[PDB]
């Protein structure tokens, strides 16, 4: 999946929605302004955490090379596949790489940034559930890392 030049131009056009002034950088102001226009309400500390994940210069900005790297990579990297698989394993006590559909539903809608019923319905539909009702989450992780 070599990154092509047209794909780079489409990332550039998204990057320019944040950096409307043409300064080549995205700060918490530019990021948070676009987000709130869509009806999101991040906090300042959440905007700083987000920028810090890709800001190698440590000056509180995202530049286009950092933006392009994040967009090209998504979740395809091996670190993402391993950590997501480690998160499922927290809820796999048997150690057999399986989790019950009903147990997945409980964790997704009752912990963390809970999924809505419709979100979790789409998630269980997308996993090829076995007839017992058990989900092989390691093949679920490869579908999100492909």
């Amino acid at each position: 999946d070599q990154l092509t030049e047209e794909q780079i131009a489409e990332f550039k056009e998204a990057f320019s929605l944040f950096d409307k002034d043409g300064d080549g950088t995205i700060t918490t102001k530019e990021l948070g302004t676009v987000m709130r226009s869509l009806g999101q309400n991040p906090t300042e500390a959440e905007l700083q955490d987000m920028i810090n994940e890709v800001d190698a210069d440590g000056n509180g900005t995202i530049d286009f090379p950092e933006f392009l790297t994040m967009m090209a990579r998504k979740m395809k990297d091996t670190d993402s596949e391993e950590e997501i698989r480690e998160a499922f394993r927290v809820f796999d006590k048997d150690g057999n790489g399986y989790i019950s559909a009903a147990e997945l539903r409980h964790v997704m809608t009752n912990l963390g940034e809970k999924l809505t019923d419709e979100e979790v319905d789409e998630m269980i539909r997308e996993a090829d559930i076995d007839g017992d009702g058990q989900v092989n989450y390691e093949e679920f992780v490869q579908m999100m890392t492909a």
Partner: protein, 354 residues
């Protein structure tokens, strides 16, 4: 694919009993250890001269059964590997056999069969029996034992070194002094090296009886230096024992906390939300059908990627341990928030009434 369901379920079951045994799965592993160990003991007893015949008698049968069972288990495991998706098709199977310990097992099995076949340099074919012990060393997944021992030894290095140093000094000194006393009367203590042999075999508390002091001066000196240094030569065991016990207790202390929780659950959610950006019915509407302003959806995806990366980090961090100073930190946060609340009351009273 119902039958395919049953096939895959069975495959996963056997792979679990072999690769990650738990509960009743350990029963099969104990039986294999009993077989390898019996083979070893039979070989050793075969070394004797008076028992060579019966030893080889039993060894033939046991070695044959061993070869058959281990070949069968190897084939069954390399097949069962099919459960996990990593090793699918002969491509994945071969990728599996690339593992180090798997190739080690295959080598050992081929070698055992070659030995039995050559049975029909006999001494070398014998000596090659010691290879079985590899089937025991392999049970240690990733040298866990060595790593644990090394960690605990390194943590206490200072005390161990002190014990060994002082003990060595006491040994030198006591050996010299006793040698001075028994030099003439007793024939054992002919030279200094003999006195050192005695000193070691005593201070360690082995006590063969090879050499013992005969003259009362030597006996008093030995009693004194023993009741002084025997404790030095026995410290390492005590130090390491207490180290292991304390480490186990403290670890079992971390498990009660269950601090990591929430981060793992949120990571799966941020990953699903990012993934669903590109396939959800939420985006299969006339509104989203991309042609006029593609960047809007790209910007929405870029935000979900950033949140996914925040959730992955918070998830990885959970593994790291946390200090007991959190209570001070919550008081600092709680006090500061409340002190700011009284200020906001004070400013409003001063605004309205003045």
């Amino acid at each position: 694919s119902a039958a395919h369901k049953r096939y895959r379920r069975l495959q996963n079951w056997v792979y679990n009993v072999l690769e990650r045994p738990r509960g009743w799965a350990f029963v099969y592993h104990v039986f294999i250890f009993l077989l390898v160990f019996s083979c070893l003991v039979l070989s050793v007893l075969s070394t004797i001269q008076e028992h060579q015949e019966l030893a080889n008698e039993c060894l033939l049968i046991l070695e044959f059964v061993m070869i058959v069972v281990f070949g069968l288990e190897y084939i069954v495991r390399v097949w069962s590997a099919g459960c996990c998706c990593r090793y699918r098709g002969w491509q994945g199977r071969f990728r599996f056999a690339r593992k180090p310990f798997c190739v080690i097992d295959f080598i050992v099995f081929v070698a055992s069969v070659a030995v039995i076949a050559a049975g029909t340099a006999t001494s070398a074919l014998r000596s090659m029996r010691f290879l079985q012990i590899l089937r025991m060393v392999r049970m240690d997944r990733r040298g866990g034992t060595w790593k644990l021992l090394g960690s605990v030894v390194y943590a206490h290095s200072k005390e161990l070194i002190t014990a060994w140093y002082i003990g060595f000094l006491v040994l030198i000194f006591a050996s010299f002094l006793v040698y001075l006393a028994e030099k003439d009367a007793n024939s054992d203590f002919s030279s200094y090296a003999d006195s050192l042999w005695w000193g070691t075999i005593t201070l360690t508390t082995i006590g063969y009886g090879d050499k013992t002091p005969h003259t009362w001066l030597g006996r008093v000196l030995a009693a004194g230096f023993a009741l002084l240094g025997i404790s030095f030569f026995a410290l390492p065991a005590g130090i390491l024992g207490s180290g292991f016990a304390l480490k186990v207790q403290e670890q079992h202390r971390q498990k009660h906390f269950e601090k990591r929780r929430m981060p793992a659950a949120n990571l799966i959610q941020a990953a699903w939300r990012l993934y669903s950006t590109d396939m959800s019915r939420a985006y299969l509407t006339a509104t989203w059908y991309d042609d006029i302003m593609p960047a809007v959806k790209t910007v929405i995806r870029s935000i979900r990627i950033l949140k996914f990366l925040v959730a992955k980090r918070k998830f990885k961090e959970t593994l790291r341990p946390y200090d007991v100073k959190d209570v001070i930190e919550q008081y600092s946060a709680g006090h500061l928030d409340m002190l700011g609340r009284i200020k906001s009351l004070q400013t409003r009273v001063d605004q309205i009434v003045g």
